[PDB]
Design a protein around this ligand. Structure first.
Ligand SMILES: [Ca+2]
Ligand SMILES: [Ca+2]
Ligand SMILES: [Cl-]
Ligand SMILES: [Cl-]
Ligand SMILES: [Cl-]
Length: 279
């Protein structure tokens, strides 16, 4: 399949070279997989989600996304126009309040919630969790993300936006999950992206167009926006039978575009997620 005039990051993950604007993908499109977006919530009624999104859990007075961040991330996973995996099922877990903040104890509960809740849902091709959030190092937050991976969910997390080594942030620094840095449309490391040997992969992160609350759209930047490109790519490859939740991060790194990025520090991987679709 081909989507003309796609956002640049969708085009980039289906291309060997930068500067193109069509997104190529197998029409299966993640059907039969499930992606949990663990964030400020999701505006499920946005037309772009087509009834494929729903809120399953909140820790605040409401389950609605009053911020936008969680809706934008979910749109990059799975919206019809701006999403990688256009037929996947999206589940929202609201661990962050509408200012974008939340306690580590709440985020830990949300991760253990997903490891159980997947047994209540129909996801025969597999289950992914997208975590576009982070803070200072916490061994309890890292262990929670490791449990979720071990339970059989592909866990993708954002490296963080400090232009610093990600070893000092959680859950970015947890080695068993998939830690995602950000690149821009010119195949440079985004100037804010964290780096380090704990990174696994890069995805598009600067100037990313996706869904927003109030049924709108906008373009914003961060490792937050890179992470759901990889989450959606995982769900897409799992639906194709190429990989499993346990090995998807390794499979994405195996099959990535290699050596294409500039401004990569010595000792950080030079790998850019790629769906390897041969039309
Ligand atoms: Ca959410
Ligand atoms: Ca990692
Ligand atoms: Cl996310
Ligand atoms: Cl890793
Ligand atoms: Cl690369």
């Amino acid at each position: 399949a081909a989507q003309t005039n796609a956002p640049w990051g969708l085009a980039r993950i289906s291309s060997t070279s930068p500067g193109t604007s069509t997104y190529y993908y197998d029409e299966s499109a993640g059907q039969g997989s499930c992606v949990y977006v663990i964030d400020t919530g999701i505006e499920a009624s946005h037309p772009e989600f087509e009834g494929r999104a729903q809120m399953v859990k909140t820790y605040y007075y409401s389950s609605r996304d009053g911020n936008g961040h969680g809706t934008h991330c979910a749109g990059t996973v799975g919206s019809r126009t701006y999403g990688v995996a256009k037929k996947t099922q999206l589940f929202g877990v609201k661990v962050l309040d509408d200012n974008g903040s939340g306690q580590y104890s709440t985020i830990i509960a949300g991760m253990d919630f997903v490891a159980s809740d997947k047994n209540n849902r129909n996801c025969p091709k597999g289950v992914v969790a997208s975590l576009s959030l982070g803070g200072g190092y916490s061994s309890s937050v890292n262990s929670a993300a490791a449990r979720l991976q071990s339970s059989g969910v592909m866990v993708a997390v954002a490296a963080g936006n400090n232009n610093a080594d990600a070893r000092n942030y959680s859950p970015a620094s947890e080695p068993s999950v998939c830690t995602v840095g950000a690149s821009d449309r010119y195949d440079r490391r985004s100037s804010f992206s964290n780096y380090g040997s704990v990174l696994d992969i890069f995805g598009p992160g600067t100037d990313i167009l996706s869904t927003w609350i109030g049924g709108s759209t906008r373009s914003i930047s961060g490792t937050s926006m890179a992470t759901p490109h990889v989450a959606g790519l995982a769900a897409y490859l799992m639906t194709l039978g190429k990989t499993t939740a346990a090995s998807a991060c390794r499979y994405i790194a195996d099959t990535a575009n290699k050596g294409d990025l500039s401004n990569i520090p010595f000792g950080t991987v030079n790998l850019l997620a790629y769906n390897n679709y041969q039309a």
